[PDB]
C-alpha cells in the first residue's frame, strides 16, 4: 500500500569536543589539532646549517679565545650557544655586548682577513698567563696587544683604507690596567688614549686605572669596541697607549643567520622550524612550545590546544 523513506546523517561513538561562537564545548564527529605542543627534544641538522658553540660564546669565537680557535672563519645559519659555555682568556667587557652579538650573529660569518698594519716603535703580540695558548702565555687570536719598545711608546698613527666593495668590521679594544705601576710599566705614559675614526664617525676611549675583581689571574680588563668601515671610506687609529689593536677585519654579510640559546642536542632529521626545546613540525599554524623560534614556524600562542571541527555535530542515541 505504501513505503517510508527516512533521511538521516551519520554519527560516531567516539566524538571530540570543540568550541564555537555560542558554545564553549560541543561534540563533533572529528577534529584536528591546530597547536603544536610537543618536540622530540632534538635540533634537526637539516636543512639549516647549525653551528654548535659547545664551550664557546659567539663573542669568544669572534675575539679568538684559544679554546674557541676551532671556530675561525666559521659560518652558520643558526649559531647555538650552550649554557655550559665559559671564557678562558684575558677578562674583558663589551659595552653594548648585546648589539655586537646581534650584528655578528646576523652577519652569519667569522671570516677574518688579516691586514698589514704597521705599528712603528712598539712591541707586538703581547700575551698573558690569563690567556694560555698551548703551555705558554697568549692572547685573543684576532687582537694584537701593543706595549713599549725599549723605554718608549710613541704616538701610533695608522690608516687602513677600504678599497673593497663590502663593509669591513674591525674589532679593537682598550686595556684598563689595575695600577699606575702596570700602566707606566706597559705604556710609559701615565694616561693612555685610543681614537678610532672614519670620515663618518669617531670614538675616543680613555682608560681607567683601578682594581676590579680578580678573574683568571688579573684585576685588569680589556674593553672591546667595534667600527664599521664602508667602501671608499678609511679607518684611522691613533693612540699614545693602551691600544689593543685589530689584526684585520671581519667580512660582513646580510642574510638569514641568527643565534639561539639552547641545550638541546643536534640530531639527524629534517625540520624547517627550530626552538630552544628542539625542532618542531610546522604543519600546524600555531604552537605552544616556545616563543623563541627560527625558520618557517607556526605562530606562538598561549593555548596548548585548539581543535578545528572537521565534521558535523555528533548526535548519538
Amino acid at each position: 500500500p505504501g513505503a517510508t523513506l527516512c533521511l538521516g546523517h551519520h554519527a560516531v561513538p567516539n566524538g571530540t569536543l570543540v568550541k564555537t561562537i555560542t558554545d564553549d564545548q560541543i561534540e563533533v564527529t572529528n577534529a584536528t589539532e591546530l597547536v603544536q605542543s610537543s618536540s622530540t627534544g632534538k635540533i634537526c641538522n637539516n636543512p639549516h646549517r647549525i653551528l654548535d658553540g659547545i664551550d664557546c660564546t659567539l663573542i669568544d669565537a669572534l675575539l679568538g679565545d684559544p679554546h674557541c680557535d676551532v671556530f675561525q672563519n666559521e659560518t652558520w645559519d643558526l649559531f647555538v650557544e650552550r649554557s655550559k659555555a665559559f671564557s678562558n682568556c684575558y677578562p674583558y667587557d663589551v659595552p653594548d655586548y648585546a648589539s655586537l652579538r646581534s650584528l655578528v650573529a646576523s652577519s652569519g660569518t667569522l671570516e677574518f682577513i688579516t691586514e698589514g698594519f704597521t705599528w712603528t716603535g712598539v712591541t707586538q703580540n703581547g700575551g698573558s698567563n690569563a690567556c694560555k695558548r698551548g703551555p705558554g702565555s697568549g692572547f685573543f687570536s684576532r687582537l694584537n696587544w701593543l706595549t713599549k719598545s725599549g723605554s718608549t711608546y710613541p704616538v701610533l698613527n695608522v690608516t687602513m683604507p677600504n678599497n673593497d666593495n663590502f663593509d669591513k668590521l674591525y674589532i679593537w679594544g682598550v686595556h684598563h690596567p689595575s695600577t699606575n705601576q702596570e700602566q707606566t710599566s706597559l705604556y710609559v705614559q701615565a694616561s693612555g688614549r685610543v681614537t678610532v675614526s672614519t670620515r663618518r664617525s669617531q670614538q675616543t676611549i680613555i682608560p681607567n686605572i683601578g682594581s676590579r675583581p680578580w678573574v683568571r689571574l688579573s684585576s685588569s680588563r680589556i674593553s672591546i669596541y667595534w667600527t664599521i668601515v664602508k667602501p671608499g671610506d678609511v679607518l684611522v687609529i691613533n693612540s699614545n697607549g693602551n691600544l689593543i689593536a685589530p689584526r684585520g677585519y671581519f667580512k660582513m654579510r646580510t642574510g638569514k643567520s641568527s643565534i639561539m640559546r639552547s641545550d638541546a642536542p643536534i640530531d639527524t632529521c629534517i625540520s624547517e622550524c627550530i626552538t630552544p626545546n628542539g625542532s618542531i613540525p610546522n604543519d600546524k599554524p600555531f604552537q605552544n612550545v616556545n616563543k623563541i623560534t627560527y625558520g618557517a614556524c607556526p605562530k606562538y600562542v598561549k593555548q596548548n590546544t585548539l581543535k578545528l571541527a572537521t565534521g558535523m555535530r555528533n548526535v548519538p542515541e
Binding site: 517510508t4 527516512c6 616563543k291 548519538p316
Partner: protein, 172 residues
C-alpha cells in the same frame, strides 16, 4: 544549527551509517535497507577540506629577531622588548581563539545546511506522491520496490508513473 535538521527535526544521527555522512533508510514490502548519498556527503567534505587547507597554509618564516629571555635586569629597553613580545602573543592568541570559534560555528551550520538541502531535494523529487511526516521521513503513498527506492536515491524517479496511484491513496 540555523536550519534545524541536525539535532532538530532529525532526532539523532546513525552510528550505523559508515559509508558516508548523509543518507537514506527505508521500509517497503521487501524489508529494510540503508544507503549513503554521495553528492551531499562529498559537498560537506569538500567544504571542510577547503577551510582546513586555508587554515593550515604555511605563511610564517622568520630569521633574526629580538631577544626574548634575559639573564640580567636592565630597565627600560628590556621592559619594551618584553612588552612588544607579550603584546604580539596576546594578539595572535586572540586571533587563534576567534578563528577556530568562527570556523567551527560555520562547520556546524554548513553540515546542518547540507542535511536540509538533501531533505528538500528529495521532497521535490516526490512531488505530490509523498508527505513530510515531520521527523525527516517521507510517507510514500504507493508500491515502491527496491528498484523504486534506488531511483529516488540516484535521481531518476519519475513521479508521473506513480501519481495516479498515490493521489488516490492520499485523498481516500
Amino acid at each position: 544549527g540555523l536550519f534545524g535538521a541536525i539535532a532538530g527535526f532529525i532526532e539523532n544521527g546513525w552510528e550505523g551509517m559508515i559509508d558516508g555522512w548523509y543518507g537514506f533508510r527505508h521500509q517497503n514490502s521487501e524489508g529494510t535497507g540503508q544507503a549513503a548519498d554521495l553528492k551531499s556527503t562529498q559537498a560537506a567534505i569538500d567544504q571542510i577540506n577547503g577551510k582546513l587547507n586555508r587554515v593550515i597554509e604555511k605563511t610564517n618564516e622568520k630569521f633574526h629577531q629580538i631577544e626574548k629571555e634575559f639573564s640580567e635586569v636592565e630597565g627600560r629597553i628590556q621592559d619594551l622588548e618584553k612588552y612588544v613580545e607579550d603584546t604580539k602573543i596576546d594578539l595572535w592568541s586572540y586571533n587563534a581563539e576567534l578563528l577556530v570559534a568562527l570556523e567551527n560555528q560555520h562547520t556546524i551550520d554548513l553540515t546542518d545546511s547540507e542535511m536540509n538541502k538533501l531533505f528538500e531535494k528529495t521532497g521535490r523529487q516526490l512531488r505530490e506522491n509523498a508527505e513530510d511526516m515531520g521527523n525527516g521521513c517521507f510517507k510514500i503513498y504507493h508500491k515502491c520496490d527496491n528498484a523504486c527506492i534506488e531511483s529516488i536515491r540516484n535521481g531518476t524517479y519519475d513521479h508521473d508513473v506513480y501519481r495516479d496511484e498515490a493521489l488516490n491513496n492520499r485523498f481516500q
